[PDB]
Each structure stands twice: as C-alpha cells, then as structure tokens.
Amino acid sequence: TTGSFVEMVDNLRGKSGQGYYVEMTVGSPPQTLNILVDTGSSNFAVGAAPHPFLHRYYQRQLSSTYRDLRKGVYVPYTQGKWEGELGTDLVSIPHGPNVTVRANIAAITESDKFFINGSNWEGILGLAYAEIARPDDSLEPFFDSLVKQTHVPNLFSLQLCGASVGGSMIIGGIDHSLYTGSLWYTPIRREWYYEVIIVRVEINGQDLKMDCKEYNYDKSIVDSGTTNLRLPKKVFEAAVKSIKAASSTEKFPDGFWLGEQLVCWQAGTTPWNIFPVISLYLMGEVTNQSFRITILPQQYLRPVETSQDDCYKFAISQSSTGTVMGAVIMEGFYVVFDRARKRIGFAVSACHVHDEFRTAAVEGPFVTLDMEDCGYN
Numbered sequence: 001t002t003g004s005f006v007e008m009v010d011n012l013r014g015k016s017g018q019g020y021y022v023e024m025t026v027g028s029p030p031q032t033l034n035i036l037v038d039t040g041s042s043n044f045a046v047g048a049a050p051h052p053f054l055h056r057y058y059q060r061q062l063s064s065t066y067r068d069l070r071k072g073v074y075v076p077y078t079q080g081k082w083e084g085e086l087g088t089d090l091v092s093i094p095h096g097p098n099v100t101v102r103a104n105i106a107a108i109t110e111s112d113k114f115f116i117n118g119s120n121w122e123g124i125l126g127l128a129y130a131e132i133a134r135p136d137d138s139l140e141p142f143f144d145s146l147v148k149q150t151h152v153p154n155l156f157s158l159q160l161c162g163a164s165v166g167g168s169m170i171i172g173g174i175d176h177s178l179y180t181g182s183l184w185y186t187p188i189r190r191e192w193y194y195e196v197i198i199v200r201v202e203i204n205g206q207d208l209k210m211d212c213k214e215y216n217y218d219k220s221i222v223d224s225g226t227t228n229l230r231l232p233k234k235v236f237e238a239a240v241k242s243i244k245a246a247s248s249t250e251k252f253p254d255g256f257w258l259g260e261q262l263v264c265w266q267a268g269t270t271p272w273n274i275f276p277v278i279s280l281y282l283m284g285e286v287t288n289q290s291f292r293i294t295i296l297p298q299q300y301l302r303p304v305e306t307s308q309d310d311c312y313k314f315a316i317s318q319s320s321t322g323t324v325m326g327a328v329i330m331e332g333f334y335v336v337f338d339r340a341r342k343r344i345g346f347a348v349s350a351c352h353v354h355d356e357f358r359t360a361a362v363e364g365p366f367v368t369l370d371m372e373d374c375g376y377n
C-alpha cells in the first residue's frame, strides 16, 4: 500500500509565500511549464498569451497534438480573474508517474490580478473534483483523465516542506520515506472540494469550547492553493484570544495578529516555546473515533526576508467561506488524498520545520461522540 516513488521525491519548488509548483510539459514537441499544485480548484489552466509576469507560455500553434474545443471560459475569483479558450493536448509530468495523457486545458488569453509577479509558475493544476470545474462538471479535471487513461491508482499525496520552499507530489502512491508514525484518515465528506469535518480545536491543550458546527461553517476544506489557516469569524476570534494569552510573556502590536505587521527577533533567537501549538481534531473512519493533528508556531509564523534579524508574519486569518486548511496546516504533515477510498490521510511530515523540543504530531484515537452533528447540513 506504500513504497518507494523515487522519481517524484522532491519534485515541488516554490518561492516563500507564493505557491508550490510542479514542472509539467504540454504539447508536441513538449513545452515546459511550472504549474501551481492546487487542491482547492479543478481546472488545468495555463498561460497561453504574453503577460508581463509570464516569461513563457503555452503556444498552441507549435503543438501538433493540440485540438481546439471551440469554447471560451471565464473564471472570476474574489481577488483576480482570467478568461481562456478550451482545448486539449498531451500532458506529462517529467518528475512524475512516467505517463503521457490527453487532458483538457484552459489556455489563458486574458487575466487581471491572477498571475503573481515573481511566483515562477505559469499555470495551475486544479486537483479537486469536477463539481467545481469551470465552466461546469462536463470538463473532466486532469487527475480524473490521468487515472482513466493509465493504470495510476486513484490517489495522490502531498508533502509541502516550507523552510526557497520545496516538497513532493507523489502521483498514484504513498511514499514511505516522507512521513513517520501512523497515517490517520478522515473521510472526504463530499466530492467537490476536499471537504472534511473538524470535531474539536485546542490551543496548547486548552479546548476552544464552541459548538463544533462553528468549526465547519459553512465548510471545512484542505487547500494547497492557500497559504494561511483560515477560520470562520467566530472561531478566528476565539483562537486569537487564546494564542495571545498563551504567548503573553511577550506583547505584540494588534496589527501583528491581523497579519499586517511583522514581528522580529535577533537572528537565531526566535522564542518558539512561548507560542502555543494548535490542534485540530478530525473525524475518524470508525464510529465515535477521532484523531488530531498538531502544528507549531514554525508553521503559523511564516518567515519573511536588517539581515541580522529573523522576521515573521502571523498566518492565521479570517474566512467568510468556512475553514481553509492551507499550507499552514499542510506543511506539518504528509497528506494523502485517497480518492479511491474517499478519505484524506495525515501523518507527521519527515521534512517539517521544528525545534529540538517540539515536533508536529498526529495522534489517535479519541472518543468523540456525535461527530455527524459537527457537519453544517
């Protein structure tokens, strides 16, 4: 069920704070592009016209295998938007599963506030399900097509390392060398986003003590396309108050807790131990069982490049659309998106940033009753 996937180890790169990307090729002969790994969307969208932030793009007229689907697509986000032309081409991942598949491609011809200056990615690989694909669910996502066309198991796993950044996307398997300890699995509640259920939250062991529906209002998802741990308004406010109280041996400006200002220390003297750990309990696979994943301040204090000082941004923030377990969560763990068994596994990542005295953790089981109640029905 696990093993060695040696070609896919260390295939992810990124700039600190701008996205984890994998190298892919599109077309014949192959055109190389860096593509953002994104579990919170479902389109394979690539830049396909010049743009000041893109130093290369998909040139359909140079690909003998390109097929025009003759239909536009317009995708607005909250901050940013793009428009493109639908088609297909042959697609590979050079440091991947050693197969070439024909996939749908949204060739981006126009955009605003979508490509990031200096991010070094020219497109996005949306790994979620068809239900949120644009323009609709008839456009099969990349991974659906890869599994149908090859013998690749219906599973992928992500190890995002953090502290420039790097990691691994294992297509079709679970690499045993990227984690320690047990893999603990939570159910995928519904196949659209990768939706999970949080049943309990602690700050340094102290229960936040809310109706567990508040943790999942109106949904809880696992999203590699988001930096922060994003929490509903009522949950975020309770969490910040508890983190303040636990770290009260040092006081910081209010703007730090809003993510608007950096706090610094003399290089090497960052006092990790005064900051608390953060635990999310996830619904288990067995009735009345949960497990918990625990991250450190090394995950939610994110480094920002005086060279003699280490400075950081607080990366827990408020969400209007439910909980988003972003890179802040995922960088503590090796996360298994087991689509075949409709579950998401977590294990202590073998590359996660920590100190001599604390590590990230995945522990279980715990008797948690009435866990279906925690879902926003």
Ligand SMILES: C[C@@]1(c2cc(NC(=O)c3ccc(C#N)cn3)ccc2F)Cn2cccc2C(N)=N1
Pocket: 017, 018, 019, 020, 036, 038, 039, 040, 041, 077, 078, 080, 114, 116, 124, 223, 224, 225, 226, 227, 327
């Ligand atoms: C397609 C979408 C998207 C993601 C991104 N990602 C980054 O810039 C990004 C930046 C840093 C990390 C990390 N460490 C990960 N990602 C950029 C554009 C975009 F359009 C839309 N969107 C809105 C909110 C969340 C999402 C999402 N999951 N994907």
